[PDB]
Ligand binder design. Sequence first.
Ligand SMILES: Cc1cc2nc3c(=O)[nH]c(=O)nc-3n(C[C@H](O)[C@H](O)[C@H](O)COP(=O)(O)OP(=O)(O)OC[C@H]3O[C@@H](n4cnc5c(N)ncnc54)[C@H](O)[C@@H]3O)c2cc1C
Length: 634
Amino acid sequence: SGVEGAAFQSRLPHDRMTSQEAACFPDIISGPQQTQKVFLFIRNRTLQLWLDNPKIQLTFEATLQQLEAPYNSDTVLVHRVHSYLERHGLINFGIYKRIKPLPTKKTGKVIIIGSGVSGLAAARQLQSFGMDVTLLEARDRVGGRVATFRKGNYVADLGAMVVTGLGGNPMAVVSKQVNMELAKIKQKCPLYEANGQAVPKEKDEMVEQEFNRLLEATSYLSHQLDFNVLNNKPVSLGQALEVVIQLQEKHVKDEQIEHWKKIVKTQEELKELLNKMVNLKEKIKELHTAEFLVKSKHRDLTALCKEYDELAETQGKLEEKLQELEANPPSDVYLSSRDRQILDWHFANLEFANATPLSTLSLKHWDQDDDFEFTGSHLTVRNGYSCVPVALAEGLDIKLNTAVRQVRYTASGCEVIAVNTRSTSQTFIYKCDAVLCTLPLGVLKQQPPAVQFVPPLPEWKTSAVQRMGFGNLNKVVLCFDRVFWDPSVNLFGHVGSTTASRGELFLFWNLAPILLALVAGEAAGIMENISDDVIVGRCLAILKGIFGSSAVPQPKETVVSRWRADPWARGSYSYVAAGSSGNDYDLMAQPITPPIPRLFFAGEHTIRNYPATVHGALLSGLREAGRIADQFLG
Ligand SMILES: Cc1cc2nc3c(=O)[nH]c(=O)nc-3n(C[C@H](O)[C@H](O)[C@H](O)COP(=O)(O)OP(=O)(O)OC[C@H]3O[C@@H](n4cnc5c(N)ncnc54)[C@H](O)[C@@H]3O)c2cc1C
């Protein structure tokens, strides 16, 4: 599975041609299947050669010399496959030693707005393709939403921190190229209630199980029964979850009522059987030849005692049924008050991963990209994720503290206007043939706008911008000079007191003596209005309740993100809002033409299968580089 592995690691089926390939190789698709098999092998083998050694450029010549007979004889097919893989960034992407040209002459000028991972990835491709490219970045650093805090021996990521599995992840290649150290995240996450006591194992698993059944029930309601619209409004995941919970509570109350009726019935029978027994005793009373009269009262009294003694047995078969029934009552409630708070911790955790309250997520599409998840454990970046954007910036023409304010594009070229953010007096004007916009969705949604488009973007584009969600989440970095927590535990949770505030500092994690506290959901935007000192104080109180007031010292350093207030972000990353879908991600990727595409788009919000991630941003950049090169360089 070597060549089979290369296709998989490249997100491609090893045994068939993708739609994109069919388009580029119409003669292969509509030809001898035997040729397709040769195409797929050359493609898979070329990807393998690249994947086995991504720190060095894989040339056409070298691909040909390493292919085996007969493949090494079809020079022309190999060239076409290598050119295709290269143009689209499946090989020779990221950071690697070139071993050939980098023509001193440059064809075409492209301006790239934003120097985040998508802009950086696209730039390296475009430059290696021989175009003249310049990146305009508003901040005084590269990386965008990859933002690493570094002081002394302290390292912590305020932006992206997790590599979500290596299997199929292009970040696996990049990780090798920049030598970024990755470490698995242990899953064990003990939970502590608001009073500091740990949630027992049995309870933990019970609630988690319900969390899972609840989500599965909404998935069933949505994709099997199609209940995605109600009162002419798209249903949200949070809305559906609350209804499923209501049904559970109704069911519990129903079974409770039936059990009470069983009790009351049994009680009524006992009461009645008792009354007839009392009346029979009274009959036995009254009832209480001479020789014959004796035998006669005998058969009479014994007939009434064959009646009464028996009545006492059917009575014992009732007092038995009763006492059982009320020893085996059904559940009193679906979720106890505490149980619900623990369930809210799992919802808070989901709001964290999705960067938004559950009531804003599309029930039908929120998890639209699951089928593309990578395989493998999730890893964290020991030395800080900024090592990637920093290494990708090597050798590019990047203009920092340069905030773009207007993008003008015509059938003859474009102009990008920006201003120095250190001296808002001077305004630069950069002319070019094409503009690649990597501005965050949050910035594109800004009202009044942060950057004007002349002409204004089409309605089909802006309405997509408006429908799509742009979430938020924050982190508080607590640097200590000591480790007072369990070092064999990477994560531990804090169960809040209310549903509304379930996302407040609900999670803590480590890996130096550093703890990060996470703020999710509704709490994420609200907490940004609290000073660092006060938020830090709330963290310590929580930690003190867990570990003990004397075990928790004051932090040496703290850093608090406020992604929604950050003007260059306006949030953390997108999410499929109620009323949107995977299609808006495609609409966001569509280039704008004045009869030749001039304005292009990349960014995590323009890639349908991998949104809201660093790998998605990277792939979107590789994608646009290819589309732009195809237009200008042929
Ligand atoms: C808190 C947080 C946690 C996250 N965790 C993870 C994670 O664990 N794993 C994962 O894979 N992803 C994670 N993500 C998402 C991931 O970081 C992003 O999807 C990705 O980095 C986006 O890259 P981008 O190039 O699309 O956008 P950006 O990185 O935002 O790049 C856009 C650039 O445009 C610049 N800019 C803005 N306005 C202007 C202007 N007017 N003129 C010029 N420049 C401008 C911005 O400064 C920025 O540099 C997280 C994001 C956040 C914020």
